[PDB]
Amino acid sequence: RPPQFTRAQWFAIQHISLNPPRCTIAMRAINNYRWRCKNQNTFLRTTFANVVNVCGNQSIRCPHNRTLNNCHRSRFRVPLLHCDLINPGAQNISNCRYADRPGRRFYVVACDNRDPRDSPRYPVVPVNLDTTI
Amino acid sequence: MRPPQFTRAQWFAIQHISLNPPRCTIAMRAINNYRWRCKNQNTFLRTTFANVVNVCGNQSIRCPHNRTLNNCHRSRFRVPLLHCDLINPGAQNISNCRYADRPGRRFYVVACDNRDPRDSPRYPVVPVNLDTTI
């Protein structure tokens, strides 16, 4: 996480996009903050507010980060865009290319208490996209 | 004019909220794909939707740029932003519009209205237009 973003803000940058460009473009926003291109990333085509509501759902064991049980499953599926790295050997991050996989899935988010810099409108916020189902 | 795929609040967010937007020529494609001709100017506020919703609860004022309305609200503090100005209005197609970048930090004025049934219930009153920046 880049220090200038709260965990919730970084979650949104990586995983919330109502209308994302194709992955090779969309992923630049993330990979600019990296030495190596991210192997995979999912953008949920929804709103931050909608994800905050999912933080109020039943807490469960996190599927992909199993040391934690602050995860929450959406009650319904959302449209989304999955991005998969096609050229992992790549020179600089500007040269990374991604395959696009539009889809529609449930999601599982880890949620924590808000950063003091996050709006008091959400006492609890999503901080990781653990997986989609 | 708003694509039917989006509520007024969603279209507001697409046009005007971006915490870390790409340069204008890239950022503006997201908007211009939905337009007959490229937009002459557009500001992206580098803030959160929640912060803009807060502005909706500020004192109601005459809209500076859409003066038939008085459902506007001026922010209490400035936000970083990116302003985009169309460079080549003689562009042959939407695909080739290019924009000059002007980062800044300004107060802003939004028009707000009651939410769409399809908007999150977390915000009964939502921004629907960026009227101007100050």
PDB file of C-alpha atoms in Angstrom:
ATOM      1  CA  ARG A   1       0.000   0.000   0.000  1.00  0.00           C
ATOM      2  CA  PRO A   2       1.291   3.454  -1.012  1.00  0.00           C
ATOM      3  CA  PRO A   3       1.465   5.588   2.160  1.00  0.00           C
ATOM      4  CA  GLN A   4      -0.623   8.425   0.721  1.00  0.00           C
ATOM      5  CA  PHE A   5      -3.690   6.157   0.631  1.00  0.00           C
ATOM      6  CA  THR A   6      -5.588   4.753   3.566  1.00  0.00           C
ATOM      7  CA  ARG A   7      -6.173   1.025   3.390  1.00  0.00           C
ATOM      8  CA  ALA A   8      -9.744   1.710   2.257  1.00  0.00           C
ATOM      9  CA  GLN A   9      -8.582   4.110  -0.472  1.00  0.00           C
ATOM     10  CA  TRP A  10      -6.030   1.617  -1.764  1.00  0.00           C
ATOM     11  CA  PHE A  11      -8.707  -1.067  -1.751  1.00  0.00           C
ATOM     12  CA  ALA A  12     -10.853   1.194  -3.938  1.00  0.00           C
ATOM     13  CA  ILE A  13      -8.005   2.007  -6.332  1.00  0.00           C
ATOM     14  CA  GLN A  14      -7.265  -1.684  -6.860  1.00  0.00           C
ATOM     15  CA  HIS A  15     -10.737  -3.170  -6.768  1.00  0.00           C
ATOM     16  CA  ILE A  16     -13.541  -0.688  -7.457  1.00  0.00           C
ATOM     17  CA  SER A  17     -14.205   0.590 -10.954  1.00  0.00           C
ATOM     18  CA  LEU A  18     -17.690   1.191 -12.306  1.00  0.00           C
ATOM     19  CA  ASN A  19     -16.423   1.387 -15.899  1.00  0.00           C
ATOM     20  CA  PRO A  20     -12.780   0.296 -16.175  1.00  0.00           C
ATOM     21  CA  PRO A  21     -10.707   0.519 -19.338  1.00  0.00           C
ATOM     22  CA  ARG A  22      -9.228  -2.700 -20.706  1.00  0.00           C
ATOM     23  CA  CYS A  23      -6.874  -4.392 -18.273  1.00  0.00           C
ATOM     24  CA  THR A  24      -3.636  -3.380 -19.974  1.00  0.00           C
ATOM     25  CA  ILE A  25      -4.652   0.241 -19.351  1.00  0.00           C
ATOM     26  CA  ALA A  26      -6.500  -0.256 -16.041  1.00  0.00           C
ATOM     27  CA  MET A  27      -3.581  -2.073 -14.455  1.00  0.00           C
ATOM     28  CA  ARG A  28      -1.158   0.806 -14.993  1.00  0.00           C
ATOM     29  CA  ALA A  29      -2.844   2.614 -12.104  1.00  0.00           C
ATOM     30  CA  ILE A  30      -1.716  -0.180  -9.782  1.00  0.00           C
ATOM     31  CA  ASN A  31       1.584  -1.217 -11.371  1.00  0.00           C
ATOM     32  CA  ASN A  32       3.018   2.312 -11.309  1.00  0.00           C
ATOM     33  CA  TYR A  33       3.338   1.695  -7.547  1.00  0.00           C
ATOM     34  CA  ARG A  34       5.262  -1.584  -8.122  1.00  0.00           C
ATOM     35  CA  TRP A  35       8.645  -2.973  -9.196  1.00  0.00           C
ATOM     36  CA  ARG A  36       7.036  -5.967 -10.881  1.00  0.00           C
ATOM     37  CA  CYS A  37       3.638  -6.176 -12.527  1.00  0.00           C
ATOM     38  CA  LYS A  38       0.816  -7.664 -10.486  1.00  0.00           C
ATOM     39  CA  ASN A  39       0.036 -11.223 -11.559  1.00  0.00           C
ATOM     40  CA  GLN A  40      -3.733 -10.857 -11.284  1.00  0.00           C
ATOM     41  CA  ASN A  41      -6.340  -8.309 -10.247  1.00  0.00           C
ATOM     42  CA  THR A  42     -10.121  -8.061 -10.114  1.00  0.00           C
ATOM     43  CA  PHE A  43     -12.058  -4.785 -10.524  1.00  0.00           C
ATOM     44  CA  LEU A  44     -15.590  -4.844  -9.077  1.00  0.00           C
ATOM     45  CA  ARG A  45     -18.036  -2.801 -11.125  1.00  0.00           C
ATOM     46  CA  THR A  46     -19.846  -1.354  -8.137  1.00  0.00           C
ATOM     47  CA  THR A  47     -19.568   1.486  -5.595  1.00  0.00           C
ATOM     48  CA  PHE A  48     -17.555   1.852  -2.400  1.00  0.00           C
ATOM     49  CA  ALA A  49     -20.799   2.338  -0.469  1.00  0.00           C
ATOM     50  CA  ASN A  50     -22.094  -1.009  -1.727  1.00  0.00           C
ATOM     51  CA  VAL A  51     -18.940  -2.754  -0.512  1.00  0.00           C
ATOM     52  CA  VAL A  52     -19.211  -1.045   2.895  1.00  0.00           C
ATOM     53  CA  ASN A  53     -22.665  -2.612   3.243  1.00  0.00           C
ATOM     54  CA  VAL A  54     -21.107  -6.052   2.641  1.00  0.00           C
ATOM     55  CA  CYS A  55     -18.822  -5.358   5.627  1.00  0.00           C
ATOM     56  CA  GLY A  56     -22.013  -5.630   7.688  1.00  0.00           C
ATOM     57  CA  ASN A  57     -22.671  -9.213   6.519  1.00  0.00           C
ATOM     58  CA  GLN A  58     -21.746 -12.342   8.514  1.00  0.00           C
ATOM     59  CA  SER A  59     -18.050 -12.466   9.382  1.00  0.00           C
ATOM     60  CA  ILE A  60     -16.249 -15.500   7.966  1.00  0.00           C
ATOM     61  CA  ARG A  61     -12.834 -17.082   7.682  1.00  0.00           C
ATOM     62  CA  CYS A  62     -10.958 -15.357   4.839  1.00  0.00           C
ATOM     63  CA  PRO A  63     -10.579 -17.872   2.000  1.00  0.00           C
ATOM     64  CA  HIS A  64      -7.253 -16.588   0.648  1.00  0.00           C
ATOM     65  CA  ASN A  65      -5.765 -15.131   3.817  1.00  0.00           C
ATOM     66  CA  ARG A  66      -6.730 -17.811   6.236  1.00  0.00           C
ATOM     67  CA  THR A  67      -5.074 -16.275   9.297  1.00  0.00           C
ATOM     68  CA  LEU A  68      -7.920 -13.765   9.335  1.00  0.00           C
ATOM     69  CA  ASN A  69     -11.638 -14.112   9.948  1.00  0.00           C
ATOM     70  CA  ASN A  70     -12.692 -10.536   9.302  1.00  0.00           C
ATOM     71  CA  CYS A  71     -14.049 -11.391   5.867  1.00  0.00           C
ATOM     72  CA  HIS A  72     -17.526 -10.880   4.478  1.00  0.00           C
ATOM     73  CA  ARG A  73     -19.358 -12.345   1.516  1.00  0.00           C
ATOM     74  CA  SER A  74     -21.632 -10.278  -0.719  1.00  0.00           C
ATOM     75  CA  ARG A  75     -25.294 -11.342  -0.721  1.00  0.00           C
ATOM     76  CA  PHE A  76     -25.473 -10.928  -4.487  1.00  0.00           C
ATOM     77  CA  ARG A  77     -23.198 -11.095  -7.492  1.00  0.00           C
ATOM     78  CA  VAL A  78     -21.720  -8.049  -9.183  1.00  0.00           C
ATOM     79  CA  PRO A  79     -20.354  -7.448 -12.663  1.00  0.00           C
ATOM     80  CA  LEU A  80     -16.571  -7.297 -12.661  1.00  0.00           C
ATOM     81  CA  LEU A  81     -13.392  -7.358 -14.726  1.00  0.00           C
ATOM     82  CA  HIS A  82     -10.620  -9.849 -13.998  1.00  0.00           C
ATOM     83  CA  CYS A  83      -7.107  -9.082 -15.262  1.00  0.00           C
ATOM     84  CA  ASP A  84      -4.436 -11.747 -15.846  1.00  0.00           C
ATOM     85  CA  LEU A  85      -0.779 -10.947 -16.671  1.00  0.00           C
ATOM     86  CA  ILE A  86       0.192 -12.390 -20.082  1.00  0.00           C
ATOM     87  CA  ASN A  87       3.914 -11.466 -20.119  1.00  0.00           C
ATOM     88  CA  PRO A  88       5.468 -11.946 -16.623  1.00  0.00           C
ATOM     89  CA  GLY A  89       9.066 -11.570 -17.839  1.00  0.00           C
ATOM     90  CA  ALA A  90       8.463  -7.973 -18.910  1.00  0.00           C
ATOM     91  CA  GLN A  91      11.072  -5.203 -18.977  1.00  0.00           C
ATOM     92  CA  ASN A  92       9.461  -2.259 -17.192  1.00  0.00           C
ATOM     93  CA  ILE A  93       5.887  -2.123 -15.865  1.00  0.00           C
ATOM     94  CA  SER A  94       4.832   0.064 -18.797  1.00  0.00           C
ATOM     95  CA  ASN A  95       5.319  -2.995 -21.007  1.00  0.00           C
ATOM     96  CA  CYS A  96       3.045  -5.355 -19.069  1.00  0.00           C
ATOM     97  CA  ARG A  97       0.035  -6.704 -20.927  1.00  0.00           C
ATOM     98  CA  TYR A  98      -3.083  -8.288 -19.502  1.00  0.00           C
ATOM     99  CA  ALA A  99      -5.810 -10.602 -20.671  1.00  0.00           C
ATOM    100  CA  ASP A 100      -9.360  -9.393 -19.976  1.00  0.00           C
ATOM    101  CA  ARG A 101     -12.009 -11.576 -18.370  1.00  0.00           C
ATOM    102  CA  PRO A 102     -15.332  -9.836 -17.750  1.00  0.00           C
ATOM    103  CA  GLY A 103     -17.565 -11.742 -15.347  1.00  0.00           C
ATOM    104  CA  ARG A 104     -20.188 -11.680 -12.632  1.00  0.00           C
ATOM    105  CA  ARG A 105     -19.426 -13.127  -9.199  1.00  0.00           C
ATOM    106  CA  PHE A 106     -19.955 -12.823  -5.467  1.00  0.00           C
ATOM    107  CA  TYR A 107     -17.071 -11.190  -3.680  1.00  0.00           C
ATOM    108  CA  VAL A 108     -15.386 -11.630  -0.316  1.00  0.00           C
ATOM    109  CA  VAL A 109     -13.815  -8.606   1.348  1.00  0.00           C
ATOM    110  CA  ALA A 110     -11.786  -8.168   4.512  1.00  0.00           C
ATOM    111  CA  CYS A 111     -13.086  -5.263   6.567  1.00  0.00           C
ATOM    112  CA  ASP A 112     -11.545  -3.327   9.420  1.00  0.00           C
ATOM    113  CA  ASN A 113     -12.171  -0.229  11.506  1.00  0.00           C
ATOM    114  CA  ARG A 114     -11.709   2.949   9.460  1.00  0.00           C
ATOM    115  CA  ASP A 115      -8.579   5.070   9.328  1.00  0.00           C
ATOM    116  CA  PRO A 116      -9.050   8.423  11.125  1.00  0.00           C
ATOM    117  CA  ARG A 117      -8.678   9.935   7.640  1.00  0.00           C
ATOM    118  CA  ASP A 118     -11.556   7.840   6.211  1.00  0.00           C
ATOM    119  CA  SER A 119     -15.045   9.388   6.410  1.00  0.00           C
ATOM    120  CA  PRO A 120     -16.863   8.927   9.737  1.00  0.00           C
ATOM    121  CA  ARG A 121     -19.753   7.810   7.493  1.00  0.00           C
ATOM    122  CA  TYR A 122     -18.192   4.332   7.451  1.00  0.00           C
ATOM    123  CA  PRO A 123     -16.936   3.139  10.850  1.00  0.00           C
ATOM    124  CA  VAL A 124     -15.964  -0.111   9.117  1.00  0.00           C
ATOM    125  CA  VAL A 125     -14.376  -0.270   5.668  1.00  0.00           C
ATOM    126  CA  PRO A 126     -13.176  -2.829   3.134  1.00  0.00           C
ATOM    127  CA  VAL A 127      -9.372  -3.149   3.143  1.00  0.00           C
ATOM    128  CA  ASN A 128      -8.755  -6.200   0.909  1.00  0.00           C
ATOM    129  CA  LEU A 129     -10.486  -8.123  -1.856  1.00  0.00           C
ATOM    130  CA  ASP A 130      -9.851 -11.574  -0.522  1.00  0.00           C
ATOM    131  CA  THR A 131     -11.435 -13.502  -3.408  1.00  0.00           C
ATOM    132  CA  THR A 132     -14.465 -13.810  -5.647  1.00  0.00           C
ATOM    133  CA  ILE A 133     -16.942 -16.706  -5.645  1.00  0.00           C
TER     134      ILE A 133
ATOM    135  CA  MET B   1     -25.988  14.059 -21.297  1.00  0.00           C
ATOM    136  CA  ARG B   2     -26.102  10.965 -19.133  1.00  0.00           C
ATOM    137  CA  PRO B   3     -25.770   7.383 -20.422  1.00  0.00           C
ATOM    138  CA  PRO B   4     -28.804   5.344 -19.354  1.00  0.00           C
ATOM    139  CA  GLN B   5     -26.465   2.716 -17.855  1.00  0.00           C
ATOM    140  CA  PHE B   6     -25.669   5.099 -14.987  1.00  0.00           C
ATOM    141  CA  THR B   7     -27.684   6.963 -12.394  1.00  0.00           C
ATOM    142  CA  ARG B   8     -27.040  10.690 -12.154  1.00  0.00           C
ATOM    143  CA  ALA B   9     -24.812  10.119  -9.124  1.00  0.00           C
ATOM    144  CA  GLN B  10     -22.860   7.350 -10.877  1.00  0.00           C
ATOM    145  CA  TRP B  11     -22.301   9.566 -13.915  1.00  0.00           C
ATOM    146  CA  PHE B  12     -21.230  12.408 -11.627  1.00  0.00           C
ATOM    147  CA  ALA B  13     -18.656  10.081 -10.067  1.00  0.00           C
ATOM    148  CA  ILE B  14     -17.400   8.869 -13.443  1.00  0.00           C
ATOM    149  CA  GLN B  15     -16.902  12.411 -14.693  1.00  0.00           C
ATOM    150  CA  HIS B  16     -15.764  14.126 -11.540  1.00  0.00           C
ATOM    151  CA  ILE B  17     -14.326  11.815  -8.874  1.00  0.00           C
ATOM    152  CA  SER B  18     -10.927  10.216  -9.277  1.00  0.00           C
ATOM    153  CA  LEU B  19      -8.417   9.855  -6.473  1.00  0.00           C
ATOM    154  CA  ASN B  20      -5.558   9.135  -8.865  1.00  0.00           C
ATOM    155  CA  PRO B  21      -6.595   9.826 -12.455  1.00  0.00           C
ATOM    156  CA  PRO B  22      -4.369   9.149 -15.443  1.00  0.00           C
ATOM    157  CA  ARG B  23      -3.370  12.078 -17.617  1.00  0.00           C
ATOM    158  CA  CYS B  24      -6.300  13.874 -19.212  1.00  0.00           C
ATOM    159  CA  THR B  25      -6.017  12.442 -22.707  1.00  0.00           C
ATOM    160  CA  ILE B  26      -6.407   8.976 -21.176  1.00  0.00           C
ATOM    161  CA  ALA B  27      -8.872   9.940 -18.417  1.00  0.00           C
ATOM    162  CA  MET B  28     -11.244  11.711 -20.788  1.00  0.00           C
ATOM    163  CA  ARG B  29     -11.771   8.665 -23.008  1.00  0.00           C
ATOM    164  CA  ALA B  30     -13.939   7.189 -20.266  1.00  0.00           C
ATOM    165  CA  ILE B  31     -16.342  10.090 -20.690  1.00  0.00           C
ATOM    166  CA  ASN B  32     -16.068  10.833 -24.392  1.00  0.00           C
ATOM    167  CA  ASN B  33     -16.870   7.257 -25.417  1.00  0.00           C
ATOM    168  CA  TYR B  34     -20.411   8.152 -24.314  1.00  0.00           C
ATOM    169  CA  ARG B  35     -20.620  11.436 -26.190  1.00  0.00           C
ATOM    170  CA  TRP B  36     -21.328  12.572 -29.716  1.00  0.00           C
ATOM    171  CA  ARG B  37     -18.421  15.039 -29.572  1.00  0.00           C
ATOM    172  CA  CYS B  38     -15.556  15.402 -27.117  1.00  0.00           C
ATOM    173  CA  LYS B  39     -16.166  17.365 -23.967  1.00  0.00           C
ATOM    174  CA  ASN B  40     -14.602  20.815 -24.054  1.00  0.00           C
ATOM    175  CA  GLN B  41     -13.506  20.809 -20.411  1.00  0.00           C
ATOM    176  CA  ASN B  42     -13.733  18.545 -17.390  1.00  0.00           C
ATOM    177  CA  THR B  43     -12.540  18.553 -13.803  1.00  0.00           C
ATOM    178  CA  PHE B  44     -11.682  15.428 -11.810  1.00  0.00           C
ATOM    179  CA  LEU B  45     -11.804  15.973  -8.050  1.00  0.00           C
ATOM    180  CA  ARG B  46      -9.206  13.940  -6.200  1.00  0.00           C
ATOM    181  CA  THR B  47     -11.431  13.091  -3.267  1.00  0.00           C
ATOM    182  CA  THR B  48     -14.025  10.564  -2.125  1.00  0.00           C
ATOM    183  CA  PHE B  49     -17.720  10.307  -2.870  1.00  0.00           C
ATOM    184  CA  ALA B  50     -18.414  10.600   0.886  1.00  0.00           C
ATOM    185  CA  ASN B  51     -16.638  13.952   1.047  1.00  0.00           C
ATOM    186  CA  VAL B  52     -18.731  15.269  -1.848  1.00  0.00           C
ATOM    187  CA  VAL B  53     -21.922  14.009  -0.210  1.00  0.00           C
ATOM    188  CA  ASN B  54     -20.945  16.084   2.831  1.00  0.00           C
ATOM    189  CA  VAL B  55     -20.921  19.186   0.646  1.00  0.00           C
ATOM    190  CA  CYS B  56     -24.543  18.447  -0.293  1.00  0.00           C
ATOM    191  CA  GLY B  57     -25.473  19.265   3.317  1.00  0.00           C
ATOM    192  CA  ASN B  58     -23.870  22.680   3.138  1.00  0.00           C
ATOM    193  CA  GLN B  59     -25.929  25.864   2.654  1.00  0.00           C
ATOM    194  CA  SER B  60     -27.984  25.728  -0.550  1.00  0.00           C
ATOM    195  CA  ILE B  61     -26.990  28.392  -3.081  1.00  0.00           C
ATOM    196  CA  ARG B  62     -27.687  29.615  -6.592  1.00  0.00           C
ATOM    197  CA  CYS B  63     -25.792  27.438  -9.082  1.00  0.00           C
ATOM    198  CA  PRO B  64     -23.072  29.575 -10.632  1.00  0.00           C
ATOM    199  CA  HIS B  65     -23.059  27.904 -14.060  1.00  0.00           C
ATOM    200  CA  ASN B  66     -26.619  26.597 -14.227  1.00  0.00           C
ATOM    201  CA  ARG B  67     -28.350  29.624 -12.857  1.00  0.00           C
ATOM    202  CA  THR B  68     -31.896  28.292 -13.284  1.00  0.00           C
ATOM    203  CA  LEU B  69     -31.164  26.051 -10.280  1.00  0.00           C
ATOM    204  CA  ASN B  70     -30.502  26.776  -6.627  1.00  0.00           C
ATOM    205  CA  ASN B  71     -29.782  23.241  -5.416  1.00  0.00           C
ATOM    206  CA  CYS B  72     -26.035  23.881  -5.358  1.00  0.00           C
ATOM    207  CA  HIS B  73     -23.593  23.714  -2.470  1.00  0.00           C
ATOM    208  CA  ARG B  74     -20.080  25.097  -2.029  1.00  0.00           C
ATOM    209  CA  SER B  75     -17.368  23.007  -0.336  1.00  0.00           C
ATOM    210  CA  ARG B  76     -15.980  24.170   2.983  1.00  0.00           C
ATOM    211  CA  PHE B  77     -12.402  23.374   1.967  1.00  0.00           C
ATOM    212  CA  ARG B  78     -10.313  22.897  -1.155  1.00  0.00           C
ATOM    213  CA  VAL B  79      -9.445  19.569  -2.747  1.00  0.00           C
ATOM    214  CA  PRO B  80      -6.661  18.577  -5.105  1.00  0.00           C
ATOM    215  CA  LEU B  81      -7.963  18.096  -8.622  1.00  0.00           C
ATOM    216  CA  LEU B  82      -7.084  17.617 -12.270  1.00  0.00           C
ATOM    217  CA  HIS B  83      -8.569  19.922 -14.836  1.00  0.00           C
ATOM    218  CA  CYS B  84      -8.703  18.832 -18.470  1.00  0.00           C
ATOM    219  CA  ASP B  85      -8.970  21.252 -21.430  1.00  0.00           C
ATOM    220  CA  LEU B  86      -9.659  20.065 -24.987  1.00  0.00           C
ATOM    221  CA  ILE B  87      -6.687  20.928 -27.273  1.00  0.00           C
ATOM    222  CA  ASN B  88      -7.952  19.784 -30.649  1.00  0.00           C
ATOM    223  CA  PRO B  89     -11.671  20.507 -31.149  1.00  0.00           C
ATOM    224  CA  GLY B  90     -11.127  19.925 -34.879  1.00  0.00           C
ATOM    225  CA  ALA B  91     -10.447  16.273 -34.015  1.00  0.00           C
ATOM    226  CA  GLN B  92     -11.867  13.985 -36.709  1.00  0.00           C
ATOM    227  CA  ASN B  93     -13.074  11.343 -34.228  1.00  0.00           C
ATOM    228  CA  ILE B  94     -13.649  10.868 -30.484  1.00  0.00           C
ATOM    229  CA  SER B  95     -10.644   8.528 -30.439  1.00  0.00           C
ATOM    230  CA  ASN B  96      -8.230  11.320 -31.228  1.00  0.00           C
ATOM    231  CA  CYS B  97      -9.257  14.026 -28.797  1.00  0.00           C
ATOM    232  CA  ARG B  98      -6.374  15.267 -26.694  1.00  0.00           C
ATOM    233  CA  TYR B  99      -6.361  17.324 -23.526  1.00  0.00           C
ATOM    234  CA  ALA B 100      -4.086  19.706 -21.702  1.00  0.00           C
ATOM    235  CA  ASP B 101      -3.501  18.821 -18.050  1.00  0.00           C
ATOM    236  CA  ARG B 102      -3.855  21.376 -15.264  1.00  0.00           C
ATOM    237  CA  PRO B 103      -3.467  19.991 -11.751  1.00  0.00           C
ATOM    238  CA  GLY B 104      -4.848  22.271  -9.081  1.00  0.00           C
ATOM    239  CA  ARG B 105      -6.453  22.688  -5.680  1.00  0.00           C
ATOM    240  CA  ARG B 106      -9.807  24.451  -5.455  1.00  0.00           C
ATOM    241  CA  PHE B 107     -13.141  24.745  -3.716  1.00  0.00           C
ATOM    242  CA  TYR B 108     -15.972  23.212  -5.666  1.00  0.00           C
ATOM    243  CA  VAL B 109     -19.706  23.680  -6.145  1.00  0.00           C
ATOM    244  CA  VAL B 110     -22.032  20.726  -6.749  1.00  0.00           C
ATOM    245  CA  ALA B 111     -25.716  20.385  -7.483  1.00  0.00           C
ATOM    246  CA  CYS B 112     -27.342  17.716  -5.355  1.00  0.00           C
ATOM    247  CA  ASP B 113     -30.623  15.818  -5.529  1.00  0.00           C
ATOM    248  CA  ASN B 114     -32.368  12.846  -3.988  1.00  0.00           C
ATOM    249  CA  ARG B 115     -30.845   9.520  -4.945  1.00  0.00           C
ATOM    250  CA  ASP B 116     -32.041   7.104  -7.596  1.00  0.00           C
ATOM    251  CA  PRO B 117     -33.700   3.898  -6.289  1.00  0.00           C
ATOM    252  CA  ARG B 118     -30.673   2.074  -7.727  1.00  0.00           C
ATOM    253  CA  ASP B 119     -28.111   4.183  -5.817  1.00  0.00           C
ATOM    254  CA  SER B 120     -26.801   2.954  -2.440  1.00  0.00           C
ATOM    255  CA  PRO B 121     -29.110   3.757   0.494  1.00  0.00           C
ATOM    256  CA  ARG B 122     -26.043   5.048   2.350  1.00  0.00           C
ATOM    257  CA  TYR B 123     -26.609   8.390   0.567  1.00  0.00           C
ATOM    258  CA  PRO B 124     -30.218   9.672   0.235  1.00  0.00           C
ATOM    259  CA  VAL B 125     -28.896  12.951  -1.191  1.00  0.00           C
ATOM    260  CA  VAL B 126     -26.200  12.773  -3.855  1.00  0.00           C
ATOM    261  CA  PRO B 127     -24.168  15.047  -6.113  1.00  0.00           C
ATOM    262  CA  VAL B 128     -25.525  15.088  -9.645  1.00  0.00           C
ATOM    263  CA  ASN B 129     -23.516  17.876 -11.309  1.00  0.00           C
ATOM    264  CA  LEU B 130     -20.172  19.596 -10.821  1.00  0.00           C
ATOM    265  CA  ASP B 131     -21.293  23.143 -11.378  1.00  0.00           C
ATOM    266  CA  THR B 132     -17.894  24.855 -11.058  1.00  0.00           C
ATOM    267  CA  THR B 133     -14.690  25.136  -9.038  1.00  0.00           C
ATOM    268  CA  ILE B 134     -13.468  28.203  -7.135  1.00  0.00           C
TER     269      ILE B 134
END
